[PDB]
Write a protein that binds this DNA or RNA. Structure first.
Ligand SMILES: [K+]
Ligand SMILES: [K+]
Ligand SMILES: [K+]
Ligand SMILES: [K+]
Ligand SMILES: [Mg+2]
Ligand SMILES: [Mg+2]
Ligand SMILES: [Mg+2]
Ligand SMILES: [Mg+2]
Ligand SMILES: [Mg+2]
Ligand SMILES: [Mg+2]
Ligand SMILES: [Mg+2]
Ligand SMILES: [Mg+2]
Ligand SMILES: [Mg+2]
Ligand SMILES: [Mg+2]
Ligand SMILES: [Mg+2]
Ligand SMILES: [Mg+2]
Ligand SMILES: [Mg+2]
Ligand SMILES: [Mg+2]
Ligand SMILES: [Mg+2]
Ligand SMILES: [Mg+2]
Ligand SMILES: [Mg+2]
Ligand SMILES: [Zn+2]
Ligand SMILES: [Zn+2]
Lengths: 25, 202, 91, 97, 212, 97, 127
RNA sequence: GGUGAAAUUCUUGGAUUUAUUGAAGACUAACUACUGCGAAAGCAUUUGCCAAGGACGUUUUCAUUAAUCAAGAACGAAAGUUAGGGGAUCGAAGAUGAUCAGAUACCGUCGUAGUCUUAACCAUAAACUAUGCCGACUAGGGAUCGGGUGGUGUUUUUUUAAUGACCCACUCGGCACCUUACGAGAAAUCAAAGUCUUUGGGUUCUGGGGGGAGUAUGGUCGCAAGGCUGAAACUUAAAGGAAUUG
RNA sequence: AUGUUU
C-alpha cells in the first residue's frame, strides 16, 4: 500500500475511534 | 429610534428670510459636529457634502441618493450602505449607479447624493443573542415580532396550517398572480434551495 | 488576576447562547466599549453613545462612525478614494 | 531634521510649552519661533498666527499632532504649541523655510 | 436562395486625410432601406490597414493603423485615426532573450480633446566592443529610462492635435527623441512607439473632420 | 540515488519558481524545470513560398514569421522526442546540437 | 488596383475556418469550414478539407467581387494551443492557388499576458 | 464542440466564426537566465508613499558587547476551517458521455466547495541541497550578480573632464559552474560529504535491525480537520543502501 | 484506442 493512503486510512480509523469513544461514556 | 444609522442636524441659513433652517440628514461616516457641510452643484467633493450625481467623478461613493431630482433622498439610507457612481451619459444627462442590492440604475444627473457612506455600518454583524434584544429592536419599529410559523397554525389561520404533522403540503413557491390570502411562502420565487455559485447576474 | 481564561466581557452571558455566538459578540463588544483617540484634541477619550455616535469626553466633539468601532474599513477606503477623486478633479 | 533641531533646542536653549505661555512670550516679544501642531484647533491656530504677525515672529507648522509635538520636544504630555525663546547652540532659527 | 449580396452596395473608404493616399479599399453594406439605414450600418466600422499600404513605402510593414468611419458622403467613407499598433510578428521579433525589455505607457490628452494611451517599447543592446553576452540594465536605469520615455510621450502629446501626432508617428521622430534622451542612460537599440490606443473622443465636429 | 548533479531542474538560490503549463498536456511544471523550445517558423513554407510570392500583390514581400515559445513537461517532451534519454555520461552535456 | 477582403483563417485543431470578410470585418463573405467539406468528424481539421473549403470560399469571393485578401491567420490561442492547426497552411495554399491575390499575411493568434489558468488540472491530461 | 475514434452539448429562436463595444474577477506571458532579493515559506505590470535589508567604501564610533542554543517566541506553500466581500477561469465532490468484462478511474462536457480578498484560525509539505549553525585551513579555471580601485583604455556630450554603457586588471561579498582529485566515501559521488584509528576548533538537534507504529493511552494545542508529545504486547532474519552482469 | 492473472 501507498504510505499516503495508509496514512489516510489510519486517519479515518482514528476519526471513527474518536466518534465511538465520544458515543461511549 | 428604530434606525440603525445616526442622524445629523445640519443648520443652514434661509437665503430669502433672515432665520435658520435645520435639516435632518443621515450622518455619513466621518461627519462630526461643528463640521461645515456644503450642498449644491458647486460644492466640493468632500465627505458629507451634498452634490448632484453628475458633478461627481466615476467611482464616487454617495449615500442618501435621490431617485429623481428634488425628492430629498431615497437610495442607500440604511446604516453602512452606499451608492457607487459607475458612469455618466452627459447627452440626455443621466448617471449610471450601483445600488446596495447590486442593481444598476440610471438616474438623472441632477439627482443629489451625500458624499460618503452611511454611518453605523457593521451593525448586523453582532448576534442579537436574545429574544429580548429582538424585542427591543422591534419595539421601536413596528409590531412584526415575534413571528408564529404558519405551519404551526390551523388551516383556518394560514395556507400552511393543519395536518397531523407540521408541513406545508403543497409547494411554498407562490405565483406572482396569486391573490391576497394565498401569498404566503416564497412569492414568485425564481429558484429555491441553498444558493450555490455566483450572484449578480448580467 | 485573570478572572476568566477566554470569555472576557462575555462572561456576563454565562453558558448561554453558544460559544461561537458569544465569541462573535465578544469581539464587537470589546470594539464598541473601547476608548479611541480623538482626531481633534488628540486624547484617548472617544467613547460610543448609541450605535454610530462617537463622542470625545474632552472637547465635546461628536463624530459619526461605525456601529461598534469609530471607523470601519469601508469608510476609510471611501475616505481615501474620495481624497483621490477630489485631487484628480482639482489637478 | 526638524525633530533633531527641536531636540537641540530643548537640550541647550530656552523654550516654553503650551498655548498660554506661548501667547505670553509672543506678547512680551521674546519669542523667536512658534511651532504649532497639525491638529491644533483652527481658531487657536489663527489666533497664534495673528499674535505672530503682530510680534513679527516666525511660525513653523509641525506635521504631527500634539502627541507627536510633545514627543519631539521630549515630554510625556501633549504639547499643542512650542515657543523658542533662545535657540542656544541650535540652527533651528536660521535653517527654516 | 436570397443571395444577400444582390442587395449590397459598395462604398469607397477614403480613409485618411494626411497619411499619404486617399484610397485604402472598398467595403460593402446593405442597401439603404426603410427601417435600416446604410449610413447607420456604416459610420462605426474600424478598418485596420498597414502603414506600408498607407504610405506606399515598405519600411512601414509593421505599425498597422486603425481608421474609424466618422462620416458618410456619397459613396465615400471619410474615416479618422482610431489607433496604431505594431504587427505581432515584428513585436515577437524585437522581443529576444539576453537583453532587457523596457515598456512605458501614458494616458495623455491631445491639445484639442483626444484621450490616448501611448505604449512605447525599448530594448537594451550591446556596445560595439561588448564581450559580455547579455547586456542587461540595472533597473534603476530602467526606472530612469521609463521616466524619460513617459515625459517625452506626455510632452509630445498635449502639444499636438490628433492630426499632428498622426503626422509625427509616421516619421518616427518620437523614437529618435527617446534615443537622444536615453543614450546617456543605456544604448536602447530598438526604441519604438508600439501602440496608440484611443480612449475618448471629443464632440464629433464634422467641420474639423473635413480635412480630407 | 541522485540521478542529476544539481537536480532534474535549474533552481539553486531560489526555493520557489512559479510553474508553467505544458503546451501539449497542460501539466503544471516549474518554469525552470520545463523544457523550453522556441519556434520561429516561417509563416508560409508549406512548399508554398513560390505560390504565395506569385499571388502576392506586393513585390518582394518578405513574409513574416511566427514566434512561439513552447514549454514541455518532462513526460511530454520525452514522448514527443523533443528531448531524448541519454547515457549516464552524456547527461552532463548542456550544449544544444 | 484591386478589391481587398480579409481572409481570416482560424486554424484550430478539430477544424479550420476560412472566413473572408470585408476590410472592416463587419460584413462577411462565404465563411466555409472543413467540417462543411468533409463528413468524417475527424478530417474537419485535415489539410484536404481545408483546401476544399478555401477553394469554395475563393470561388464565392470571386463571384461577389473580391480579388485580393489580406491574410489574418490564427490558432485557438487564449490559453490552449498558440499553434496553428494542420489545416490553416493548406487553406492559405488553396487561397493562393485559386486565383485570388494575397496581401499582408499576419498571425493574430490571441496571446494573453498570463491570464486565465489553463484547463486540465495541475497534472494535465493523463493519456 | 470535443476526441485516438466517438459520444454528451449547442445549432436556421442563426450555433461556430467576424467586427464594434461594455462588465467582472483572476493573472502578470514573451523579456525570464545553471540571473536577483528574502530567515524560510516565498517574491516578476507602472508609479507614489511607508518603513526595512545585505554587500561594498570607510585612517568614523563602541570595545568583547560574541557563537550555538533546552524552556520559550515570530513567521511559515498548498489544502482545510470561521464570517463578510467577490465569484471570470479552472475545478476535490457531484452529474453526465464514452472505454472496459467491470471503469460512478484515466479521456470528454458541465459543475458545488474551493480557487481571489478582508478579518481570524490552522502550523503541516519530497517545508529538499533529502546535506544544522559559527570559525580556520587545504588545488586549479573561466564566467556571472552587487560594490569599490586603476587604465596615455572604446563609445556616448558640456567646452577641459565627469559620470552612462563597454573593454582590460585587481579586489570584497554572493548564486553557481568546469577540471582534478593529494584527500573522503560502501559506492553513487563530494571543495566539502576534505583537514577522521595519525581519531578532540565551538555548539544545537536527531538515529540504534524490519514491522507492529507515528498505532494505543495520557497530556496539551485546535472550532474542527488535526498538530506536538508518544508506548507496549506481539511478530520477524532479514528489511534496506550503492553499484555489477543478465 | 483496449487488452487481466500465472
Ligand atoms: K417562528
Ligand atoms: K398543513
Ligand atoms: K474535429
Ligand atoms: K466560483
Ligand atoms: Mg424569524
Ligand atoms: Mg395547533
Ligand atoms: Mg385555507
Ligand atoms: Mg395552496
Ligand atoms: Mg399535531
Ligand atoms: Mg531510479
Ligand atoms: Mg519549496
Ligand atoms: Mg503516457
Ligand atoms: Mg510582464
Ligand atoms: Mg534580475
Ligand atoms: Mg524549541
Ligand atoms: Mg495557506
Ligand atoms: Mg515534518
Ligand atoms: Mg527534513
Ligand atoms: Mg528499530
Ligand atoms: Mg537499489
Ligand atoms: Mg509467480
Ligand atoms: Zn476630543
Ligand atoms: Zn505535458
Amino acid at each position: 500500500m501507498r504510505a499516503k493512503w495508509r496514512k489516510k486510512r489510519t486517519r479515518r480509523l482514528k476519526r471513527k475511534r474518536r466518534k465511538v469513544r465520544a458515543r461511549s461514556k | 429610534s428604530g434606525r440603525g444609522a445616526p442622524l445629523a442636524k445640519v443648520v443652514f441659513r434661509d437665503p430669502y428670510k433672515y432665520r435658520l433652517r435645520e435639516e435632518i440628514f443621515i450622518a455619513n461616516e466621518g461627519v462630526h459636529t461643528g463640521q461645515f457641510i456644503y450642498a449644491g452643484k458647486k460644492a466640493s467633493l468632500n465627505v458629507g457634502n451634498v452634490l448632484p450625481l453628475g458633478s461627481v467623478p466615476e467611482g464616487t461613493i454617495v449615500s442618501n441618493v435621490e431617485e429623481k431630482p428634488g425628492d430629498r433622498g431615497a437610495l442607500a439610507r440604511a446604516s453602512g450602505n452606499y451608492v457607487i457612481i459607475i458612469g455618466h451619459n452627459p447627452d440626455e444627462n443621466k448617471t449610471r449607479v450601483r445600488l446596495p442590492s447590486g442593481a444598476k440604475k440610471v438616474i438623472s444627473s441632477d439627482a443629489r447624493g451625500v458624499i460618503g457612506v452611511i454611518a453605523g455600518g457593521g451593525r448586523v454583524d453582532k448576534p442579537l443573542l436574545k429574544a429580548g434584544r429582538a424585542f427591543h429592536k422591534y419595539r421601536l419599529k413596528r409590531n412584526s415580532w415575534p413571528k408564529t410559523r404558519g405551519v404551526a397554525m390551523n388551516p383556518v389561520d394560514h395556507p400552511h396550517g393543519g395536518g397531523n404533522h407540521q408541513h406545508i403540503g403543497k409547494a411554498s413557491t407562490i405565483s406572482r398572480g396569486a391573490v391576497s390570502g394565498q401569498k404566503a411562502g416564497l412569492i414568485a420565487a425564481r429558484r429555491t434551495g441553498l444558493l450555490r455559485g455566483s450572484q449578480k447576474t448580467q | 488576576a485573570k478572572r476568566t481564561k477566554k470569555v472576557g466581557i462575555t462572561g456576563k452571558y454565562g453558558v448561554r447562547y453558544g460559544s461561537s455566538l458569544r465569541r462573535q459578540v465578544k469581539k464587537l463588544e470589546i470594539q464598541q466599549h473601547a476608548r479611541y483617540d480623538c482626531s481633534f484634541c488628540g486624547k484617548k477619550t472617544v467613547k460610543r453613545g448609541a450605535a454610530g455616535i462617537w463622542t470625545c469626553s474632552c472637547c465635546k466633539k461628536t463624530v459619526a462612525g461605525g456601529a461598534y468601532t469609530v471607523s470601519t474599513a469601508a469608510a476609510a477606503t471611501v475616505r481615501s478614494t474620495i481624497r483621490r477623486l477630489r485631487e484628480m478633479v482639482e489637478a | 531634521s526638524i525633530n533633531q533641531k527641536l531636540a537641540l533646542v530643548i537640550k541647550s536653549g530656552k523654550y516654553t510649552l503650551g498655548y498660554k505661555s506661548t501667547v505670553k512670550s509672543l506678547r512680551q516679544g521674546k519669542s523667536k519661533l512658534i511651532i504649532i501642531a497639525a491638529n491644533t484647533p483652527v481658531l487657536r491656530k489663527s489666533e497664534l498666527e495673528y499674535y505672530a504677525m503682530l510680534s513679527k515672529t516666525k511660525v513653523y507648522y509641525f506635521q504631527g499632532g500634539n502627541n507627536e509635538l510633545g514627543t519631539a520636544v521630549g515630554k510625556l504630555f501633549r504639547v499643542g504649541v512650542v515657543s523658542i525663546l533662545e535657540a542656544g547652540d541650535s540652527d533651528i532659527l536660521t535653517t527654516l523655510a | 436562395v436570397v443571395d444577400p449580396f444582390t442587395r449590397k452596395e459598395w462604398f469607397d473608404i477614403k480613409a485618411p486625410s494626411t497619411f499619404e493616399n486617399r484610397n485604402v479599399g472598398k467595403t460593402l453594406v446593405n442597401k439603404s432601406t426603410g427601417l435600416k439605414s446604410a449610413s447607420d450600418a456604416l459610420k462605426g466600422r474600424v478598418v485596420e490597414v498597414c502603414l506600408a499600404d498607407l504610405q506606399g513605402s515598405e519600411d512601414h510593414s509593421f505599425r498597422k493603423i486603425k481608421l474609424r468611419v466618422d462620416e458618410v458622403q456619397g459613396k465615400n467613407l471619410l474615416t479618422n485615426f482610431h489607433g496604431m499598433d505594431f504587427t505581432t510578428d515584428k513585436l515577437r521579433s524585437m522581443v529576444r532573450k539576453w537583453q532587457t525589455l523596457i515598456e512605458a505607457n501614458v494616458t495623455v490628452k491631445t491639445s484639442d480633446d483626444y484621450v490616448l494611451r501611448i505604449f512605447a517599447i525599448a530594448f537594451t543592446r550591446k556596445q560595439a566592443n561588448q564581450v559580455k553576452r547579455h547586456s542587461y540594465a540595472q533597473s534603476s536605469h530602467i526606472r530612469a529610462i521609463r521616466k524619460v520615455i513617459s515625459e517625452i510621450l506626455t510632452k509630445e502629446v498635449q502639444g499636438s492635435t490628433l492630426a499632428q501626432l498622426t503626422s509625427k508617428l509616421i516619421p518616427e521622430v518620437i523614437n529618435k527623441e527617446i534615443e537622444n534622451a536615453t543614450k546617456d542612460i543605456f544604448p536602447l537599440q530598438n526604441i519604438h512607439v508600439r501602440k496608440v490606443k484611443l480612449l475618448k473622443q471629443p464632440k464629433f465636429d464634422v467641420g474639423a473632420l473635413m480635412a480630407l | 540515488p541522485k540521478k542529476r548533479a544539481s537536480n532534474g531542474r535549474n533552481k539553486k538560490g531560489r526555493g520557489h519558481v512559479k510553474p508553467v503549463r505544458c503546451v501539449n498536456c497542460s501539466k503544471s511544471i516549474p518554469k525552470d524545470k520545463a523544457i523550453k523550445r522556441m519556434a520561429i517558423r516561417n509563416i508560409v513554407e508549406a512548399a508554398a513560398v513560390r505560390d504565395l510570392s506569385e499571388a502576392s500583390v506586393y513585390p518582394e514581400y518578405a513574409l513574416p514569421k511566427t514566434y512561439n515559445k513552447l514549454h514541455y513537461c518532462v513526460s511530454c517532451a520525452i514522448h514527443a522526442r523533443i528531448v531524448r534519454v541519454r547515457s549516464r555520461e552524456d547527461r552532463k552535456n548542456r550544449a544544444p546540437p | 488596383s484591386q478589391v481587398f477582403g480579409v481572409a481570416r483563417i482560424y486554424a484550430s485543431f478539430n477544424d479550420t475556418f476560412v472566413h473572408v470578410t470585408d476590410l472592416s470585418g463587419k460584413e462577411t463573405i462565404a465563411r466555409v469550414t472543413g467540417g462543411m467539406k468533409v463528413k468524417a468528424d475527424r478530417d474537419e481539421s485535415s489539410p484536404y478539407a481545408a483546401m476544399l473549403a478555401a477553394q469554395d470560399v475563393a470561388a464565392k469571393c470571386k463571384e461577389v467581387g473580391i480579388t485580393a485578401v489580406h491574410v489574418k491567420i490564427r490558432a485557438t490561442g487564449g490559453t490552449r494551443t498558440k499553434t496553428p492547426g494542420p489545416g490553416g497552411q493548406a487553406a492559405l495554399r488553396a487561397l493562393a492557388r485559386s486565383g485570388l491575390r494575397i496581401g499582408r499575411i499576419e498571425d493574430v493568434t490571441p496571446v494573453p499576458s498570463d491570464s486565465t489558468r489553463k484547463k486540465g488540472g495541475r497534472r494535465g491530461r493523463r493519456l
